Amino acid sequence: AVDPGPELDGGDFALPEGGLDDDRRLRALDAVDEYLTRKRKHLVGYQATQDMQGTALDLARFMPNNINNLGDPFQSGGYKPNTKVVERAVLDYYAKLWHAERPHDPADPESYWGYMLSMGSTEGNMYALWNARDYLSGKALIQPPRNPNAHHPVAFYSEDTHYSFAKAVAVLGVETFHAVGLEKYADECPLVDPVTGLRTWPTEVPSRPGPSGLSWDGPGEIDVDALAVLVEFFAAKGHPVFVNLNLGSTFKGAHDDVRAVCERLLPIFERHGLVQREVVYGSCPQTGRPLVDVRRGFWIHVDGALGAGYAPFLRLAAEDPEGYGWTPEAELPEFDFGLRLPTAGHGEVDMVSSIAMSGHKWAGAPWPCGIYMTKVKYQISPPSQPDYIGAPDTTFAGSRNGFSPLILWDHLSRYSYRDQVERIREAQELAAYLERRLTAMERELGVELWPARTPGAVTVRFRKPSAELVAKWSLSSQDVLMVPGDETTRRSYVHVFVMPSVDRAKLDALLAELAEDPVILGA
Amino acid sequence: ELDGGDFALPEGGLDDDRRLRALDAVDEYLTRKRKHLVGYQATQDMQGTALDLARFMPNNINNLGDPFQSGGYKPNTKVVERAVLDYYAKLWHAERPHDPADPESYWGYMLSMGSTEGNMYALWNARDYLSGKALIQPPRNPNAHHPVAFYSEDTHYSFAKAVAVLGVETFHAVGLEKYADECPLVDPVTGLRTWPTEVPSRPGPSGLSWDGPGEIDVDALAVLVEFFAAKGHPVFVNLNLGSTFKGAHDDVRAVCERLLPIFERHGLVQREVVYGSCPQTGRPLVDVRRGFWIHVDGALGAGYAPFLRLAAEDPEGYGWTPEAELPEFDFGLRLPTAGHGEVDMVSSIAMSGHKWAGAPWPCGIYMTKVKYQISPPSQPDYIGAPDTTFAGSRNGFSPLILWDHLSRYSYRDQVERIREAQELAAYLERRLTAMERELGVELWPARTPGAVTVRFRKPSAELVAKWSLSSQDVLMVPGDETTRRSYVHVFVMPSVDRAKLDALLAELAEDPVILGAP
Ligand SMILES: CSCCC/N=C/c1c(COP(=O)(O)O)cnc(C)c1O
Ligand SMILES: CSCCC/N=C/c1c(COP(=O)(O)O)cnc(C)c1O
After folding, report:
1. Is B470 within 8 Å of A250 when comparing Cβ atoms?
2. Which residue range forms the structural domain that includes residue A243?
């Protein structure tokens, strides 16, 4: 099989007490560059854009600055070397793209609020679930200028949800429907397990079945029917509800049908008094009663780590296909802050409470970054009031990366909407091309590759090749059990993500190597 | 200031001329501010890190997963990351190499946020360890599972945030809820036994903490810890090694010496913990853990304190006797037990790379030991490496920044950097008091011995904005809004030299608020 090339050797990097001379330092940095350069040119297995030569030329000049966007993006604060003016421009652009109300205005509850992340979307998902936990549990909101389960939120998300949510749930102590089901409602699961036929609580909301009848070969989209049954169960018990929906899922690149979910859940929320409800937020200032305000009892979060970066552009083309000269083959669901639905008796309800996106995914960046966005009306009173930063502590991070706003600003400034439509068009068409070539390879060589692509996704999955090929092309791997609870049914998959830095020549080079790979051939 | 109009991003994009004009405006703004920043604990001169490392900006580097495991995302710098972690492990007297089979060996990782991530991780780790959640895979008492957090009034706001995020209760919350009338401390202002909101810091000339050094009151800590330990609670203590406003160093060694006998008396050195019930008959599955966790928030100080203590150990060899003693604080701090065994006292340390070293963005280190590692929240296929960190994707450019920094300086050069900063902080304090005598104004200058920050009366807004002076208000008698005083501080980082201080002092001497001072 192929050569992935040398790894870095730890001996070259050991840092002695006396320091390293300039020659040893440069040799080491050159080894890093040679390694990273070879790997970045061949990476096709992760949802991370690899080409930003232009941003490097333009933004290298900023590396001498210790930039810190400490505090809320909407006030400078005392740390003057900051890029909050740039950060606000990037936030504004995405607020427009996601049909949020702009400008940000602390006096307008419907207006957007958001900030740029210093980790990746893990930060945005953690923040979302923190914000939701406190909002749904009755903690105090930010300053303007009988039911025992009312304060016990329950989280719902599909089996294709990223591991950051399992992490966030544990960090924040938000209980999933699975945990609450087992603890409080052990024999009352409303779903029958398709393998066993028993009413056992599933660990996550089922995703849609594939040809097998099971989720492993399905599209990776949440089963809306299953979600609605589960949400109804807990809403009827009096619990407020947190739902995460994946817009570009980690392995399959699937898009949960956010509009279908919202249409199906709104009447459930209305029936069970979760559209508008009174909430006690601590005891009353002196005498032993409570205070009360009015809140919704549900929170829909869209994990658009990947997909919030391209879905607006695909949807633009879908709305005017002759203008963009492209009809996307798959429909991507309405998902953003513009999604508004009628009710029986509360008027139009704006359905989505928050969105996360990663900048190092579709746009590309040299480090993790991204955006969390919500609305003013959801903002929680900050944990404390630090004088020393001069700006409110409204964010998950303390010190914040102020170079990432420059990265994304530079990116966004170089492309029109039409250019952004072209980038998602080419990726969609090249993903379809890859799937076609993989099935043609199965016919030419008489090998099984198990190729699969969810319509509208920018990723294609297929049988895992040799370890050396996986290492050369940074293929991401996932094992599946074709029948849950049986380790004899394991299949090993990889996938390829067709990002804007992946072109036809790169895919053709990979395909030529797959065709001669010893695992692929010697099956 | 920067004009928002220059930065609005149109649907159609910006042309190359508008783009460059905007980027030039940003550079001009940042350059002017960087050169005058003296009010925050952030090194502003990286002395060629940018020359050396700009070349890496074309790479989407991702150190996804554990630093000590291969993963599938091959454009990563984990080899570099491990070199950096190894350097700090040695500096902090941790056991190396990292080895999952050696419980005493270090484990740590590089942060993608700043020290906020490391403080959050430490409290998460401690919460789960002290509460009996399952530990990582190697190759009676109703309060036993209810940890209680303690830290001083000079603790950074990231802890208040972390406590809220993680649902860890502070001694104040638990005191109020469970033990409302049993506070063992008397309030120095009121004389009532009201639970204070944080562990008292040491008093100043006022008899109150506001003009004190900013170090935790070890007596008060010990009284509080004993109270909750005696009730059966396990205990988390955060100690500040270079506090945010006063740059104080909690006496970590004194704290550990005072707490160990308390832990031994109340069975917190080695205790049985229930971490489940057995798969058939639900009998408690059990291992032995400690019932306390001491974290050092070295966001700032973990970067310089080793080097000062190196000089203190050999002052004639380094040609410098530090004037203040910085406490032993690290993984090497080991105390005798009642039975003449030894206990390694500190469980974790956090440090920020954008503070003492300098970086273009927030970064840092969290470090603990293998014996404390918690079982990951889930098992992910698609990353390869275990999900053992707070971040998911991780900044792999920061390891390059710190490696490059550390590679350029010997231990002796690092000792010189902290020497120069200590001497310049002492100079600043002398010049401020000389200014009070020359101009006949009261500047309230204050510097905790051994700190690299000096606090003084807040000057005009204009000067504050020019020099990025950090501000803090204090009430000189807690609860009385008429006793408010506004301070600023200057942090003498390695990028602050005599000339910069002298220029600031010349402006302060003509400042309207300083000259107009009642
Ligand atoms: C940049 S490629 C390696 C990361 C893969 N996925 C991350 C990922 C994440 C967490 O984002 P981060 O790693 O913290 O930037 C969240 N949600 C979804 C749907 C994802 O797919
Ligand atoms: C870099 S100067 C602005 C940050 C000031 N203080 C941060 C700070 C932090 C939180 O670190 P970060 O902001 O997340 O990097 C924690 N602990 C202590 C003792 C601190 O002083």
Report:
1. no
2. 83-417
